[PDB]
Ligand binder design. Structure first.
Ligand SMILES: NCc1noc(-c2ccccc2F)n1
Ligand SMILES: NCc1noc(-c2ccccc2F)n1
Lengths: 269, 268
């Protein structure tokens, strides 16, 4: 991959691998999410920021500050088949003091048609204390020369699903998968659970008959709290709905501490 | 990637990704194992065999026959760092009626130095009845024009590590990780548990202090029986010593064996 001509975005091509595809012989949403974070990292690398998933400045490193994902929103129109080449363009934009947005556009490299889009909200957190804080002006300005100054949105539309509030699933859940635990392959280089793992865990409580008769069009996931290496997760799903829609909750298997909530939208094949 | 000049081997380059590396910022043995499987598939594709992990002929398809892994053996001298290019060359060779071998050599693209090698034994199985059978002469012949005729071994040395018998760990195990279950991401396109998942499960009962102060040099893993989508696995490890370990995977209920193995680790 490379920075584009204006230096304000980053593009990379990926060949979908045998082990990245599901029963449809196309890429899983987890492979897609992995590729989003790969191009995100390579973009950080390309302009001198940290390449540990946190994309930090020297200023932030001095202060033990990191970026953490608050929300992921992914919309897929066609999943790339095994052997197919998918092109991903990615950029960031500050949303003032709240935090920053990273957005992506996925294309068929052959036709150049848009096959998916994603957006994510990130917030600044002290690494050690876990306390959020508004982005300081010194730090803001470090990033602004790497971001477009005119609004550029993967999700322009006035009211769009990427910004909707997600309610809290009430017991009893229609469906559950109990006792989920991360293994070493679920951890990043920092030994923190990889954000994509939580997508896997959300989808584990979707009944197999849905997965066999539907394709995932939209997923929205909020991140509240991280699952530690030694934590155990319960995944909860309730039907809310030709389209199928679900409300989702991840919570710690003991005390029921919320770690994530989300929605998915599925369309008959 | 591409078949090489003589058409009897296949080569591919891989850029190591951010999410593919562990705490040392180098590729995990599971990332390596996945790339072995990927070049294997691309080699099958390049000469017209099935691309579903089974590399079947049209004959085998009529008979509902598949190739199944009996043994994986992997030796790594240097794990590629994030952003590094690793080149993997791969080839198959018939071992008569017993089955076939796929071998790999891993290189640093920049230096051309060997950074690891792997070998695997495959047996022929009826996919419905799960009965083994020796390889048909008509099936042998279909594969011989795509394999070297002169012996070509990742592990040439008589009685090397890759051919040793693995004994059955006896209770009580020194270390365990219990109640392991596959998720949808551990399944392939056939909805069978991916072979690399059993590698992750073996290593889950290595103490963290070992992983933190050692690098994995050798893994040998026998595959005896499949974990189904809805099965639950216990992972057992005992120190047999460099650090060495004996490994056993078995179903959480009745203690049916699915895998046994060994690992060898060196202090950093
Ligand atoms: N707006 C805040 C911001 N946060 O990251 C970035 C960023 C920009 C370009 C390349 C990598 C990057 F991480 N900007
Ligand atoms: N010896 C039996 C055998 N089994 O696979 C092969 C094989 C050869 C070349 C390319 C792909 C292949 F799968 N041969």
């Amino acid at each position: 991959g490379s920075l584009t001509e204006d230096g304000l975005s980053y593009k990379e091509k990926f060949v979908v691998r045998s082990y990245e595809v599901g029963s449809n012989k196309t890429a899983t949403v987890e492979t897609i999410a992995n590729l989003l974070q790969e191009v995100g990292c390579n973009h950080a690398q390309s302009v001198g920021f940290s390449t540990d998933g946190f994309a930090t400045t020297t200023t932030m490193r001095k202060l033990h500050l990191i970026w953490v994902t608050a929300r992921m929103h992914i919309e897929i129109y066609k999943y790339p088949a095994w052997g197919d080449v998918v092109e991903i363009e990615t950029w960031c934009q500050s949303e003032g003091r709240i935090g920053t947005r990273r957005d992506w556009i996925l294309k068929d490299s052959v036709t150049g048609e848009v096959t998916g889009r994603a957006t994510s909200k990130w917030v600044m957190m002290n690494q050690d204390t876990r306390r959020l804080q508004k982005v300081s002006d010194d730090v803001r300005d470090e990033y602004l020369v790497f971001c477009p100054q005119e609004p550029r949105l993967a999700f322009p539309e006035e009211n769009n699903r990427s910004l909707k509030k997600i309610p809290k699933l009430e017991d009893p859940a229609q469906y559950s998968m109990i006792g989920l635990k991360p293994r070493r392959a679920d951890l990043d280089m920092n030994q923190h659970v990889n954000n994509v793992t939580y997508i896997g865990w959300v989808l584990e409580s979707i009944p197999q008959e849905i997965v066999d008769t539907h394709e995932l069009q939209v997923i929205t996931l909020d991140y509240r709290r991280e699952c530690q290496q030694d934590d155990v997760v319960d995944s909860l799903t309730t039907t809310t709905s030709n389209d199928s829609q679900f409300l989702h909750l991840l919570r710690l298997s003991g005390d029921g501490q919320e770690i994530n909530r989300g929605t998915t939208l599925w369309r008959k094949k």
